[PDB]
């Protein structure tokens, strides 16, 4: 499947993300209001991907329209990008299982991880700015990119695009914060530590939310949701956990009417007597 993510306006952008979500995921029965929900990605074979045509970087203009992201559908990772003018798919090294028919595939030495991209980009996501202008710059960098090894600028472009596409698809919080940059005032979106943390906890969040049954709160590692609007305002799409599991097999523990990721509670309840701990050096 191919979808467009149109950055022309906040409306076009959110519309685009919502359309993608509806097609690739199904709302959780217990975390759904109207047509805004936390949805679980529908099962698809590994290797299944959907293409995202980037549009609207120059509001409503058919300009800067040769970039397509290839997104692995089951986990929403950006497997690579396609320059549709040259018909070339630059694929990350960890996505050799993704095959795009009809294009020249350039298998890269660079893997898709943020650890790598941030390193090559010499750009940390925490504090990373994204604006319409830097997405255009990002687009130009990707279109100028050629090679089997990502460059700094191409990595910066991918960090920005993954954030506003795949991460926004996962997190309504990021969709909300980033979309402000698309307004006529063209402010700058600055990725926050909290935004980064969400992205880093997506699998954990994914394993927990399906168990939610209206508890007074949800705690997953550093992430806390105090009510359903916090959940809905933050998370839009989660992995189908039916990277969901880190260790163990118990998704959650309800403690004082708060649904905790069990691993989180286990991680602060595994301390022995403090006096013995500190003195036993």
């Amino acid at each position: 499947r191919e979808f467009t993510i149109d950055f022309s306006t906040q409306q076009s952008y959110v519309s685009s993300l919502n359309s993608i979500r509806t097609e690739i995921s199904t709302p959780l029965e217990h975390i759904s209001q109207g047509t805004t929900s936390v949805s679980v990605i529908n099962h698809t074979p590994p290797g299944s991907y959907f293409a995202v045509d980037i549009r609207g970087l120059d509001v409503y203009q058919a300009r800067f329209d040769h970039l397509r992201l290839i997104i692995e559908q089951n986990n929403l990772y950006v497997a690579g990008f396609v320059n549709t003018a040259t018909n070339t798919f630059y694929r990350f090294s960890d996505f050799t299982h993704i095959s795009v028919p009809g294009v020249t595939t350039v298998s890269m030495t660079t893997d898709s991880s943020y650890t790598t991209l941030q390193r090559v980009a010499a750009l940390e996501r925490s504090g990373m700015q994204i604006s319409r202008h830097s997405l255009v710059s990002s687009y130009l960098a990707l279109m100028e990119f050629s090679g089997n090894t990502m460059t700094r600028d191409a990595s910066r472009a991918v960090l920005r695009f993954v954030t506003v596409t795949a991460e926004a698809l996962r997190f309504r919080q990021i969709q909300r914060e980033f979309r402000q940059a698309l307004s006529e005032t063209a402010p700058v979106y600055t990725m926050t530590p909290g935004d980064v943390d969400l992205t880093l906890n997506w699998g954990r969040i994914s394993n927990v939310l399906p168990e939610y049954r209206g508890e007074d709160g949800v705690r997953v590692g550093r992430i806390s949701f105090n009510n359903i609007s916090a959940i809905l305002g933050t998370v839009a799409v989660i992995l189908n956990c039916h990277e969901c599991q880190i260790t163990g097999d118990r998704p959650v523990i309800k403690i004082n009417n708060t649904l905790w990721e069990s691993n989180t509670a286990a991680a602060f309840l595994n301390r022995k007597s403090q006096f013995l701990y500190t003195t036993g050096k």
Partner: protein, 70 residues
């Protein structure tokens, strides 16, 4: 003997550094410090604990306890 089996109703760190837990309506205390986090963790996670001891009268000491997620 199995003094009590159930969820911990409350726990309490005492001034003499022992630790009390109320299980199935009876209070027991233990002077074993490492049982403090073990018992508090059981209480927080809703584990069923089985307090075991030579004697089992409420307000009695114990140093054997089984923990079950259920």
């Amino acid at each position: 003997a199995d003094c009590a089996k159930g969820k911990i109703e409350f726990s309490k760190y005492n001034e003499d550094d022992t630790f009390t837990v109320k299980v199935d309506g009876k209070e027991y205390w233990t002077s074993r410090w490492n049982l403090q986090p073990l018992l508090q963790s059981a209480q927080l996670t809703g584990m069923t604990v089985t307090i075991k001891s030579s004697t089992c009268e409420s307000g009695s000491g114990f140093a054997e306890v089984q923990f079950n997620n259920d």
